[PDB]
Specification:
part of a larger assembly, 2 chains, little secondary structure, 8% strand, globular, Spike protein S2' (chain B), viral protein
């Protein structure tokens, strides 16, 4: 969608892996705020968005 | 309420200890007040601050 009408996607009740995205070598920028690009496959979250 | 100064000293010591304990739940400008959570969420180079 556009920038002013971005689509929010709720993610819950699932197991999410993030190491396959950081090591994909396709994403230009992968800046993490509050968390680290690693040590995230060992944590569990309550409600994330996309 | 006969023994006043003794109870006052005991209450002052208890309040000092309670304040020293409760000063661990503060962030002081950090992300959180839990050192283990900080170490588990951020890598050392970013969690040093």
């Amino acid at each position: 969608a556009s920038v002013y009408a971005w689509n929010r996607k709720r993610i819950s009740n699932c197991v999410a892996d993030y190491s396959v995205l950081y090591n994909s070598a396709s994403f230009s920028t992968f800046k993490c705020y509050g968390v680290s690009p690693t040590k995230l496959n060992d944590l569990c979250f309550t409600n994330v968005y996309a | 309420s006969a023994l006043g100064k003794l109870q006052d000293v005991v209450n002052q010591n208890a309040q000092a200890l309670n304040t020293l304990v409760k000063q661990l739940s503060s962030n002081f400008g950090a992300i959180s007040s839990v050192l283990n959570d900080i170490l588990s969420r951020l890598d050392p180079p970013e969690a040093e601050v």
